[PDB]
Each structure stands twice: as structure tokens, then as C-alpha cells.
């Protein structure tokens, strides 16, 4: 058994890494294949506890990370891609 | 240090067989595209085709789809071109390049060769 | 196949020289092409990529221009080790193909 005190404050709105998919983040790169298709970010995620308000960033900043694309016929090769991430997160109203 | 060396050329008798090799050194051999281009003695560069070192899929220019063959062996990071029903307009210095390493975005240039080998088709 | 023409086929100039090469594509290619620099018995070696951009290592003295068929390679003062020839490719739709080349010589 988890303690109250301990999955509250395991819950409550903040910064969790998050798999994100690189072609949502990028939907114009429509003919490229991408190794891996999601990446590792940290990303508001939590509750608030209460129905008007709305865990928020109020700090982000950009991650580089190597990310293989392929152009089928066309080329393959690794390299760098940046992304967004939430370095601090606030419960505000909705 | 990033290197690319051939081996496998020489003299072949019209109609016959040759397979190059392109033992690649200094980083991930699957992480980059490897093309292949050859060039006729006192002439012009021509791409042959190119194959993807993580999935083993090759592309060939239509003028080498029928008789030759791209193949890999990344237990060895290594990557060969085998030739069939060879003539002489074929006698030419063969090379391999890999892609390149990006920044943003994609562009299909050739950054580091092999030395090259000559290869000579006659009876 | 997009055909790429260079020209001239082969000029002579002097060092300190500012020394122009052309190249034309037979369709828009937009600014899908690279040049490159082959010296005797060396294999070629890429100088600019994505028509303007210098690869890391090569001389400011290099320079590209251009956009959709007419592109220039422009070496702003010619330096001896300069001898070589010179190739343009495109990367616009495969299979990728290049110029015929450029013989430079330099004139003393």
C-alpha cells in the first residue's frame, strides 16, 4: 500500500517525462521516417484538484537530440533535432 | 578517424563476375546511407545507386537495376557492389561514400569517399 | 533524369584571380545542388552543399550562389593548390546526377 501523503505528492501537477511523437511535433515532415518515431520529453503532467484549474508550463527550453531520417529512395543518415520541453509547471485557472 | 576502404578490383573478362567490397571504420556503419559512384578513365562522375545500412534496402539508377547488385554484411560494416555480364564501357575507378551527418535538416551530399579501385574489363 | 550543364569546360586564370563557374539545370531544382573539388587521383571532395551552405574545412574563398536552374561556384581569388576540376550535383529527384566538370588551370 502506497501511503496518502506519498501518491498525492507523486500526482500533483509537474514535470514528467513524456514520449512524444516527433511527426506530431513536426507535421510537415510528412515524407520522413523517423528512428525513433517518439522521443523522451518532460512535459507538464499531473493534477490539480480542482475542475477550474489546468496544470500549465511557466518554463520551457530545447533539447537536441540525434534522430535518424530516412527518405525512402532518397537517403538515410542521423542527425541533430531540437525539442520543446517544460522545465516548470502551475496549476492555473481554466 | 572516419574511413572508407575498397578492395575487389582488377581485370574481369567480358560476361564476367566481379564483387567490390567497402569496409567502412571510425563510426556506426549503420547509422549512414552508402552510395556508390564510378568514374570511366579521363571522365565524368556517375551515381550507380545507393543502400540503407539499417533496413538492407537498395536503389539503383535504371541503368544498373539488371546486372548489379548492392548488399551489406554489418557484422563486418561492411557493404559490397557485385557486378554481372560485365562489358568494357564498364572499366572504371569504383567508389563508395556515405551521407552525411545533419543539422536541422536533410541534404543528400557525399562526405567521405573511399580511395577508390580501378576495374578493368578485358580478355 | 535532371541533365546539369556546366560551363566553361575548362578556363586558365592567374593567382589572385576571381575565377566563375555556371551551371544550369534542365528543370527547377530549387537550391538542391552541391559542388565539389577532384584533384588528380584523389576522389572528389564536397566544397558547398544546398547551393550556398560551406562545408566545415573548406576555404572562405569559396562561394555559391543561385536558385532554380542557373547556379555559379565563384573562388574569389585563385590560390595554386586551386588546380582541379569541378563538379555540380543535384539532389532534387533521383537518380542524383552531375555536371560534367570544370577544368581549372592556373596561368604563371
Known amino acids: 500500500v502506497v501511503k496518502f501523503m506519498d501518491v498525492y505528492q507523486r500526482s500533483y501537477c509537474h514535470p514528467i517525462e513524456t514520449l512524444v511523437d516527433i511527426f506530431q511535433e513536426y507535421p510537415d515532415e510528412i515524407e520522413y521516417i523517423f528512428k525513433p518515431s517518439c522521443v523522451p520529453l518532460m512535459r507538464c503532467g499531473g493534477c490539480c484538484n480542482d475542475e477550474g484549474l489546468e496544470c500549465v508550463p511557466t518554463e520551457e527550453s530545447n533539447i537536441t537530440m540525434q534522430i535518424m531520417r530516412i527518405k525512402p529512395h532518397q537517403g538515410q543518415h542521423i542527425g541533430e533535432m531540437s525539442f520543446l520541453q517544460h522545465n516548470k509547471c502551475e496549476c492555473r485557472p481554466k | 578517424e572516419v574511413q572508407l576502404v575498397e578492395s575487389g578490383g582488377g581485370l574481369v573478362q567480358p560476361g564476367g563476375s566481379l564483387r567490390l567490397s567497402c569496409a567502412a571504420s571510425?563510426?556506426?556503419?549503420?547509422?549512414?546511407?552508402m552510395n556508390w559512384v564510378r568514374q570511366a578513365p579521363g571522365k565524368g562522375l556517375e551515381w550507380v545507386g545507393w543502400?540503407?545500412?539499417?533496413?538492407?534496402?537498395?536503389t539503383y539508377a535504371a541503368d544498373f537495376k539488371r546486372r548489379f547488385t548492392f548488399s551489406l554484411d554489418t557484422s563486418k560494416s561492411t557493404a559490397y557492389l557485385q557486378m554481372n555480364s560485365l562489358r568494357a564501357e564498364d572499366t572504371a575507378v569504383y567508389y563508395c561514400?556515405?551521407?552525411?551527418?545533419?543539422?536541422?535538416?536533410?541534404?543528400?551530399?557525399?562526405?567521405?569517399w573511399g580511395q577508390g579501385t580501378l576495374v578493368t574489363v578485358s580478355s | 533524369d535532371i541533365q546539369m550543364t556546366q560551363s566553361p569546360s575548362s578556363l586558365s586564370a592567374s593567382v589572385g584571380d576571381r575565377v566563375t563557374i555556371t551551371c544550369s539545370a534542365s528543370?527547377?531544382?530549387?537550391?538542391?545542388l552541391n559542388w565539389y573539388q577532384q584533384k588528380p587521383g584523389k576522389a572528389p571532395k564536397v566544397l558547398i552543399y544546398?547551393?550556398?551552405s560551406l562545408h566545415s574545412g573548406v576555404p572562405s574563398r569559396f562561394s555559391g550562389s543561385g536558385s532554380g536552374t542557373d547556379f555559379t561556384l565563384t573562388i574569389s581569388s585563385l590560390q595554386p593548390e586551386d588546380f582541379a576540376t569541378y563538379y555540380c550535383?543535384?539532389?532534387?529527384?533521383?537518380?542524383?546526377?552531375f555536371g560534367q566538370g570544370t577544368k581549372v588551370e592556373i596561368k604563371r
Open positions: 561514400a556515405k551521407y552525411p551527418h545533419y543539422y536541422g535538416s536533410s541534404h543528400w551530399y557525399f562526405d567521405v
Open positions: 571510425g563510426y556506426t556503419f549503420t547509422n549512414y546511407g
Open positions: 543502400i540503407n545500412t539499417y533496413t538492407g534496402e537498395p
Open positions: 528543370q527547377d531544382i530549387s537550391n538542391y
Open positions: 544546398f547551393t550556398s
Open positions: 550535383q543535384q539532389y532534387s529527384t533521383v537518380p542524383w546526377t
